[PDB]
Amino acid sequence: HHHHMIRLGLTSFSSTLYEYASHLPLVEMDTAYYGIPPKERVAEWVKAVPENFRFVMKVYSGISCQGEWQTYYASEEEMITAFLESMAPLIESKKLFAFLVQFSGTFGCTKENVAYLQKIRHWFKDLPIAIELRNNSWYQPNFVKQMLQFMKENQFSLVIVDEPQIPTNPVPFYPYVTNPNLVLFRFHGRNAAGWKKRTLYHYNTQEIADLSEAVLKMSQEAKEVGVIFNNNSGGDAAENALQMQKVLNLS
Ligand SMILES: [Zn+2]
Ligand SMILES: [Zn+2]
Ligand SMILES: [Zn+2]
Ligand SMILES: [Zn+2]
Numbered sequence: 082h083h084h085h086m087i088r089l090g091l092t093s094f095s096s097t098l099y100e101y102a103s104h105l106p107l108v109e110m111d112t113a114y115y116g117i118p119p120k121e122r123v124a125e126w127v128k129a130v131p132e133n134f135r136f137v138m139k140v141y142s143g144i145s146c147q148g149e150w151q152t153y154y155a156s157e158e159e160m161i162t163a164f165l166e167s168m169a170p171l172i173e174s175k176k177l178f179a180f181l182v183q184f185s186g187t188f189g190c191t192k193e194n195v196a197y198l199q200k201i202r203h204w205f206k207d208l209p210i211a212i213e214l215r216n217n218s219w220y221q222p223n224f225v226k227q228m229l230q231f232m233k234e235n236q237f238s239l240v241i242v243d244e245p246q247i248p249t250n251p252v253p254f255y256p257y258v259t260n261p262n263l264v265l266f267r268f269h270g271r272n273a274a275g276w277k278k279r280t281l282y283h284y285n286t287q288e289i290a291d292l293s294e295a296v297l298k299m300s301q302e303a304k305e306v307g308v309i310f311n312n313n314s315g316g317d318a319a320e321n322a323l324q325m326q327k328v329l330n331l332s
Pocket of ligand 3: 285
């Protein structure tokens with residue numbers, strides 16, 4: 082029977098990846114955001130999980146305009162090659178859900194870095210890219226529809242986000258499919274403080290209920306749905322994810 086897919090995952094597999102892959106079908110690994118790992122480490126990660134476990138791989142900080150990447154890489158090209166060279170065993174493995182390119186609050190709707198998003202697309206050939214933004218100008222009434230169209234045109238999977246509402250930068254929860262082949266949700270929790278690893282939010286029964294409605298509404302319109310609980314304390318994220326899984330009675 083033609084089933085559309087919803088996978089639930091965390092960032093804080095933190096015990097082990099091997100044991101994590103016993104309960105969950107999806108993980109987000111942030112490890113490479115801080116430094117590009119050697120190819121053979123990625124190779125072992127691949128070997129350590131079941132045949133159809135998926136990885137959301139967060140790209141190197143330099144790729145999303147955050148890293149001090151000049152310290153380690155001579156040019157943007159050398160940096161992309163190092164990342165894609167180390168990510169080879171995952172890319173060739175078919176266990177890649179998406180590369181997450183997650184931008185800062187300062188990365189907003191400008192001609193300059195729209196043209197940077199095009200550079201991202203080129204650098205990543207035909208690879209699945211989940212784009213995340215922290216700036217509401219991308220979402221402003223005026224520029225919002227071309228924005229979604231730009232994501233569609235480039236097959237970018239625009240990350241649907243639940244996150245703290247900063248008055249001066251209110252990034253909304255905008256459930257819309259830009260790439261019908263994969264939608265990624267990321268729930269950051271709703272605690273505004275420092276919007277930070279020491280900032281806690283445990284989603285309640287009503288919130289898990291609201292977010293589940295939206296997740297289902299999206300799986301109606303996408304082949305594969307990825308849900309990452311990235312709210313603080315892995316214990317909180319894991320509790321919330323286990324709640325959702327019950328609410329959607331998943332496998
Ligand atoms: Zn366990
Ligand atoms: Zn090129
Ligand atoms: Zn609870
Ligand atoms: Zn279908």
